[PDB]
Design a protein around this nucleic acid. Structure first.
Ligand SMILES: Nc1nc2c(ncn2[C@@H]2O[C@H](COP(=O)(O)OP(=O)(O)OP(=O)(O)O)[C@@H](O)[C@H]2O)c(=O)[nH]1
Ligand SMILES: [Mg+2]
Ligand SMILES: [Mg+2]
Ligand SMILES: [Mg+2]
Ligand SMILES: [Mg+2]
Ligand SMILES: [Mg+2]
Ligand SMILES: [Mg+2]
Ligand SMILES: [Mg+2]
Ligand SMILES: [Mg+2]
Ligand SMILES: [Mg+2]
Ligand SMILES: [Mg+2]
Ligand SMILES: [Mg+2]
Ligand SMILES: [Mg+2]
Ligand SMILES: [Mg+2]
Ligand SMILES: [Mg+2]
Ligand SMILES: [Mg+2]
Ligand SMILES: [Mg+2]
Ligand SMILES: [Mg+2]
Lengths: 205, 704, 82, 85
RNA sequence: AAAUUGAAGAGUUUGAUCAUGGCUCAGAUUGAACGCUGGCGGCAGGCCUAACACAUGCAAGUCGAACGGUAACAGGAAGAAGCUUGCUUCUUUGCUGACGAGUGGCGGACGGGUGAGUAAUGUCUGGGAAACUGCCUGAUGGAGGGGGAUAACUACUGGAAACGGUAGCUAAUACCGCAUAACGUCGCAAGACCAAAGAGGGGGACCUUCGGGCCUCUUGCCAUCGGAUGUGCCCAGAUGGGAUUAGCUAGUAGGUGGGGUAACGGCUCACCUAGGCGACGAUCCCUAGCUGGUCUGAGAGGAUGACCAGCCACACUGGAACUGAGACACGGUCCAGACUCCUACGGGAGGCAGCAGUGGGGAAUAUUGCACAAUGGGCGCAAGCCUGAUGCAGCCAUGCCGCGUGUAUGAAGAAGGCCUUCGGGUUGUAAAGUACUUUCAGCGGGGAGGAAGGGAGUAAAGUUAAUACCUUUGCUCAUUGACGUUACCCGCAGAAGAAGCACCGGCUAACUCCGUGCCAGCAGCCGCGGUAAUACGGAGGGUGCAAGCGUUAAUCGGAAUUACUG
């Protein structure tokens, strides 16, 4: 149910830094992003229109760490909802608890954030939630359990989070090491290099 | 849920003898006298209850071991009603497994003997099977009505032929037409059974004067073997104070439990005489289940640790599964004798050797075939169980709190084999399932398949064993099958070093034809030269045949080796040399040289000296010494050569190498020459060239 | 006769008793005439675990319906606590 | 039968069959008597037979042998037939 | 406020093109099966075939508060004394706690199963009048007086069994009259006629033949009118295919009268009329349980009737009726047929399309499990008992969902493997190492909820002659859980025990080497394989999925390729 292989091959196939590593090191000093993985990775082929739609879906799936069955269910929920389907899909992926923990900065990676929420370390409104796909509603409180507030991982993750851009729909507090989910982020609040219309196109054939 | 009969009043007795000694007749009479049956049914009329199975009512024999029980109080009801779980076992040599399984669990036995012929070939076999498990046994000389009945001769013959210490508690009043009754030696009274009723009425009488002298002579012999038991009893006998009848019976009982004496009785079951008295002796002398505790030398650890179980209800549960029967409704049926503890219908137990959970669907007390369902079984009785999925004969069933493992006896390794095939052959895997289920019932019956022949080889203890198996498969499983000779595997080899044989396959008619030409030399190869007797030499030099096509001819010879041109037997020890050939540039394929190598191979085979190789198997027969040379004569009649004959003190051992086609059904022939008291072993040794007649025999049949 | 009982819907180890009016000869979760309320024995301390439409229940009693023991205990509890 | 209650019902249904057959035969015998008085052409004997028959069918309709509508139809057709003569 | 916001194509005819036209594929979906692989949990599902045949156990009993009664064990009295005067043993007493068998009442017509039959004595929708309806309710009234039997039982007796046969005795809320009769039935009318059953709890003085009467309370009985529920009946419309099925029908179509039904009616009979249906498809043939729904499709449509729920039909096959409020009755009866079983040979017994399970069939579908704790059902005043309904558990990756098999760091870009135009590139931060974590599994501890009730004591109110008995309402007491070692929570250990499947020529995301050489073989279509094969087999690499992955089968889609939309 999880990908346990090498993580930089995914960013090398997508050709974009998927933030699959902490970033304490420059990414070009770790892997050749401009080269695809494998023996024939130097030859960059002419992808088709089906190819670029599939590559966009695998890119957003490998950023958010979601397998195909759960990602398909997210697409059905986004098209079932009202408004923009792709924007609703991005809001459902950013509503996930591991993504909120990583975006709040309690995890340096979303995979570490998944291990923190899987090991009974994150309390939502004072209740321990052990599911990484727990959808966080607006105006909620996400905190770290008192059993793990003295860990080096969480403070090192907060240092890397203060080294990066702060989200506008979240409040954090490293003193009590808790935080508040304020609202669903709009399309302008997240990254712009994700063409979400390609995902909706892909799931229409 | 209390104890109905005290465990001291249990008797796990059983009958074993030579064929037609009168085992089933005695049990029938017992049931009648004890009140279980309301009529007497004869076995040759097919009306005996113990021979419940068809092919047992028809043939007139007993095949299976049927277990029943009865309640006997004594003639004058001298004791409370004892419960006897009597077991009738077959006497034939084709069903020795049915004795060993029943004598695994019996507490007491009784060796019934024909009066006119006492110790017969199977009497010694059931005696050795009984002393393997150290079973305390009695003796019942049946057929005292038969012409030439001699009771004191058979009590001499058991001692002489089998090496035992028998002391009779009875003396026959009369012979074939004078057998009114028997005089008892521990009472000095005569018991004359009334002819009017079926022997239910037994009149007590005095002893007649000739019998007075003989019975007084034997009565003092009884006291000495009684006084042998203890030095207190020895000083009792030389002290001159006669003896109380309780102490003889106690002393005689003491010697029976330790395999010291035999305590022969007599009677006539077909004339409804001397049966009640036998039952009494079983009460007075055979052990209870409480006597010898069951030493389970394994505590399920893997570190083999000796434990034991005594015979009481308050001990942990331990039982031994000794018989698996097949059933058309419930699958299989598992007989067991509980050594210790109490188990309930519905309780789970532990198959300790297979280490699995086993629940009891229900527990049935057994009559000959019909069942009375019962709630729970105590320690010391025999019952069958429904719903045990994987239990084999000799597996122990215990409570999982105390996992113990009993002795797990060994099976007699069948001696005769046939190849069985269906009539319509559409019932192929139905026969496979049927013989698989029948193999799980009988551990001395083997079924396998041999893919060299793609045949099914049934194996058993005799020809009668296999005849009953195939008839039971036709009736119970509805697979009508025909049997026959198992196909012996042969090989073929050549001689004369045929050389320069050229085979050319050319098929060019326009449009991608195939052309191949090969010239090869075929030479006989010595066996030790190669792991597989096949060497191909690439004598082709500087072209002529391209390197790519050089393996193709080799592969073609290999397929030709698999099926010989003569018949179909695989060719062995063949050396091939590819000295010369021809290759077309545009029409030469792997298959073209394969066809070319096959033409050349066939042509060379006929030019060469091609002979069959039969297999010869090392044979070690063990025989009594009186009929040694007859065995050798039959071996010389089975076209076998001889490498020796050892003469042990137990019997002569002859070694031989007989061809397998002449080793077909040797067990019934070997038993006919030797009163059935010989045995043998076959091991495959080598291959050797067959004579001209048998080689000419296997070629006509295979060819057409 | 016509009775008012509980039809056990819900999930395994999580029951939900639909208070229904039905003739007693039908099945438990079978044919019913009218659903007059519901009962939840695993209610979560903040929201409604029991709701009975007492007007229609009293109307069916006036027709001569039979109230089972659990339904009668729920009516007692509703009329007592409220 | 197999169930104990099934056997008891079987013997009870046969006993009630014997009893109900005698009562149905007696009731039908009185009704045929009224009909024979109709076809023979008498009016007072038919009226007398009706007075003997009317309490019979009323008691059989009361205790549960036939229905009241069946007994009511018998009386209505036979009075409609006594007004014909 | 919200309740539908929805529609992709590609390959293949030709030298090449356009068009037409079929074929094929990409998508969903399933009660699936098979191949490989396989950690956990939740929820759901699980003989689609032989309505093939079935061993065994269980699936419908309950009521002593209807009755005669004791056969079994638990008490109480006469009671010799086990006797050790308390040590309570051996005989009677139905004397009571109860209760085998029997009569009687109620329920067995419900629940459960199956889809054989049925193209309509069916279903769905909408209507209607000519009816019945146990248990449950509203109202008005009665519940008087007798009798004859008979089971059980007693004695004899036939039977291997199944089961009886005789001769006597007895009871009732069993049965049968009589009394009474209206707001009931019949008759416009005067009139005629029709019912019942008692049983328990307690009591103050009376009273008594000593049994009781008597008073009060509860419950049951009968009659009529209703209500509710259930059911029967009728009409209209709709509900498969076939015209290579075009005429069908004489109780047929209608009328009269009799009969019959709970009820109208050719429902039945006698007579009379000669009609009735049919291209708006009668008749005949084949197939089929129907529906809510389910799947697909943008929709229109197409396909389907697994689970759940409603109706229908069926209960070895054929036929029939009885009892009953309700059946032409799954675990009732009778007859006939086939089959199976038992037998002492004279006779008997049975129907898993109930739950489990077996054989057989098949590609294939599970346990001879636990408990009535809860929800219902039957009986009983109640306690309670019965419940293979149900609640659960066991088996199966069968489906859906969730989670895990680690996380961060980590270049000597280690070794090995693969490629190499020999420079190197790739596997690859991948590994090793460093640090951190402990979900799930393992171990140990704690620990809800499903429990409402019911039983004993109480207090008050109602009741009445009574501060009894009963009913209701509050209090107290000790209790009711199959699941179950429950969910859940805590803590110890260590990365620790946890990844495979398919694919890589185009369709379609992913390319090289070696071997093979129109051979082995691959393949859904085009097609590939004759010596440099990105298509075959192995390896490396990559891609897509993931405790699943592929294949097959099956429905729809793409197919505007039956085009109503079009
Ligand atoms: N004259 C006489 N004949 C007997 C006697 N006992 C048995 N027989 C006959 O021998 C045959 C009985 O032998 P069984 O006892 O039935 O055979 P078995 O000894 O039971 O053992 P298996 O044959 O292996 O089954 C029948 O023919 C009997 O009538 C006897 O006491 N006297
Ligand atoms: Mg999943
Ligand atoms: Mg002989
Ligand atoms: Mg014989
Ligand atoms: Mg025998
Ligand atoms: Mg079926
Ligand atoms: Mg009734
Ligand atoms: Mg009257
Ligand atoms: Mg059908
Ligand atoms: Mg469409
Ligand atoms: Mg029935
Ligand atoms: Mg049945
Ligand atoms: Mg079944
Ligand atoms: Mg029962
Ligand atoms: Mg290297
Ligand atoms: Mg755990
Ligand atoms: Mg609780
Ligand atoms: Mg279409």
């Amino acid at each position: 149910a999880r990908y346990l292989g090498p993580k930089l091959k995914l960013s090398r196939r997508e050709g974009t830094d998927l933030f699959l590593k902490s970033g304490v090191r420059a990414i070009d000093t770790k892997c050749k992003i401009e080269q695809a993985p494998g023996q024939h990775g130097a030859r960059k082929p002419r992808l088709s229109d089906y190819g670029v739609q599939l590559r966009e879906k695998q890119k957003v799936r490998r950023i958010y760490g979601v397998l195909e069955r759960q990602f398909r269910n997210y697409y059905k929920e986004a098209a079932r909802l009202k408004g923009n389907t792709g924007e609703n899909l991005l809001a459902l992926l950013e509503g996930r608890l591991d993504n909120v923990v990583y975006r709040m900065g309690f995890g340096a990676t979303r995979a570490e954030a998944r291990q923190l929420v899987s090991h009974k370390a994150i309390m939502v409104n004072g209740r321990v939630v052990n599911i990484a796909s727990y959808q966080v509603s607006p105006n909620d409180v996400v905190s770290i359990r008192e059993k793990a507030k003295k860990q080096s991982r969480v403070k090192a993750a907060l240092e890397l989070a203060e080294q990066r851009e702060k989200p506008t729909w979240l409040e954090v507090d490293a003193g009590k090491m808790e935080g508040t989910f304020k609202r669903k982020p709009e399309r302008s609040d997240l990254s712009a290099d994700i063409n979400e219309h390609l995902i909706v196109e892909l799931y229409s054939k | 849920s209390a104890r109905t009969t005290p465990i001291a009043r249990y008797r796990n007795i059983g009958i074993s003898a030579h064929i037609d000694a009168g085992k089933t007749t005695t049990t029938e009479r017992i049931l009648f006298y004890t009140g279980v049956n309301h009529k007497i049914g004869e076995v040759h009329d097919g009306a005996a209850t113990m021979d419940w199975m068809e092919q047992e009512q028809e043939r007139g024999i007993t095949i299976t071991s049927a277990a029943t029980t009865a309640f006997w109080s004594g003639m004058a009801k001298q004791y409370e009603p004892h419960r006897i779980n009597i077991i009738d076992t077959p006497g034939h040599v084709d069903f020795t497994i049915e004795v060993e399984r029943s004598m695994r669990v019996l507490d007491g036995a009784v060796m019934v003997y024909c009066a006119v012929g006492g110790v017969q070939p199977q009497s010694e076999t059931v005696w050795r099977q009984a002393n393997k498990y150290k079973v305390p046994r009695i003796a019942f000389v049946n057929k005292m009505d038969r012409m030439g009945a001699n009771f004191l001769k058979v009590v001499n013959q058991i001692k002489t032929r089998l090496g035992a210490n028998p002391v009779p508690l009875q003396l026959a009043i009369g012979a074939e037409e004078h057998f009114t009754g028997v005089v008892d030696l521990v009472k000095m009274k005569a018991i004359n059974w009334n002819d009017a009723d079926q022997g239910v009425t037994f009149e007590y009488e005095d002893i007649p004067a000739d019998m007075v002298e003989l019975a007084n002579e034997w009565h003092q012999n009884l006291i000495e073997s009684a006084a042998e038991a203890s030095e207190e009893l020895m000083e009792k006998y030389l002290g001159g104070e006669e003896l109380t009848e309780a102490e003889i019976k106690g002393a005689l009982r003491q010697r029976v439990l330790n395999n010291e004496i035999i305590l022969v009785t007599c009677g006539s079951a077909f004339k409804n005489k001397g049966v009640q008295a036998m039952l009494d002796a079983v009460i007075d002398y055979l052990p209870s289940p409480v006597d010898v505790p069951a030493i389970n030398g394994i505590l399920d650890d893997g570190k083999d640790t000796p434990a034991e179980r005594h015979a009481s209800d308050d001990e942990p549960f331990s039982a031994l599964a000794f018989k698996i029967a097949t059933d058309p409704f419930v699958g299989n049926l598992t007989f067991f004798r509980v050594y210790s503890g109490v188990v309930n219908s519905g309780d789970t137990v532990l198959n300790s050797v297979k280490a699995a959970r086993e629940r009891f669907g229900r527990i049935v007390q057994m009559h000959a075939n019909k069942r009375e369902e019962i709630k729970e079984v105590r320690a010391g009785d025999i019952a069958a169980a429904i719903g045990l999925k994987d239990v084999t004969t000799g597996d122990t069933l215990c409570d999982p709190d105390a996992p113990i493992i009993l002795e797990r006896m060994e099976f007699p390794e069948p001696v005769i084999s046939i190849a069985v095939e269906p009539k319509t052959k559409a019932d192929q895997e139905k026969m496979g399932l049927a013989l698989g289920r029948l193999a799980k019932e009988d551990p001395s019956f083997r079924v396998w398949t041999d893919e060299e022949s793609n045949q099914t080889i049934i194996a058993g203890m005799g020809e009668l064993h296999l005849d009953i198996i195939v008839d039971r498969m036709k009736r119970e499983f509805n697979v009508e099958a025909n049997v026959g000779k198992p196909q012996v595997a042969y090989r073929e080899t050549i001689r004369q070093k045929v050389t320069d044989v050229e085979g050319k396959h050319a098929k060019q008619s326009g449009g991608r034809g195939q052309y191949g030409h090969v010239v090869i030399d075929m030479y006989p190869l010595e066996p030790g030269s190669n792991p597989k007797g096949y060497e191909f030499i690439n004598d082709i030099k500087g072209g002529v045949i391209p390197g790519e096509y050089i393996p193709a001819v080799d592969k073609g010879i290999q397929e030709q080796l698999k099926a010989g041109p003569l018949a179909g037997y695989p060719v062995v020890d063949m050396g091939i040399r590819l000295h010369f050939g021809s290759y077309h540039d545009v029409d030469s394929s792997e298959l073209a040289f394969k066809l070319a190598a096959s033409i050349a191979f066939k042509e060379g085979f006929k030019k060469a000296k091609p002979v069959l190789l039969e297999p010869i198997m090392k044979v070690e027969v063990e025989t009594p010494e009186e009929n040694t040379g007859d065995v050798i004569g039959d071996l010389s009649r089975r076209r076998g050569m001889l490498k020796g004959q050892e003469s042990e003190v137990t019997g002569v051992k002859i070694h031989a190498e007989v061809p397998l086609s002449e080793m077909f059904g040797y067990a019934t022939q070997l038993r006919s020459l030797t009163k059935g008291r010989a045995s043998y072993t076959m091991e495959f040794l080598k291959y050797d060239e067959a004579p001209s007649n048998v080689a000419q025999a296997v070629i006509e049949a295979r060819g057409k | 006769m016509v009775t008012i009982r509980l039809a056990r819907h819900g999930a395994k180890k999580r029951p939900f008793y639909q208070v229904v009016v039905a003739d007693s000869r039908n099945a438990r979760n079978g044919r019913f005439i009218e659903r007059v309320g519901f009962f939840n024995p695993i209610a979560s301390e903040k929201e409604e675990g029991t709701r009975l439409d007492l007007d229609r229940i009293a109307h069916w009693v006036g027709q001569g319906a039979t109230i089972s023991d659990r339904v009668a205990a729920l009516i007692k509890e509703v009329n007592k606590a409220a | 039968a197999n169930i104990k209650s099934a056997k008891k019902r079987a013997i009870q249904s046969e006993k009630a069959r014997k009893h109900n057959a005698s009562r149905r035969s007696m009731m039908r015998t009185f009704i045929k008597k009224v009909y024979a008085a109709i076809e023979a052409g008498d009016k007072a004997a038919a009226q007398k037979a009706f007075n003997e028959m009317q309490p019979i069918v009323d008691r059989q309709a009361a205790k549960g042998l036939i229905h009241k509508n069946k007994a009511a139809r018998h009386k209505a057709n036979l009075t409609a037939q006594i007004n014909k003569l």
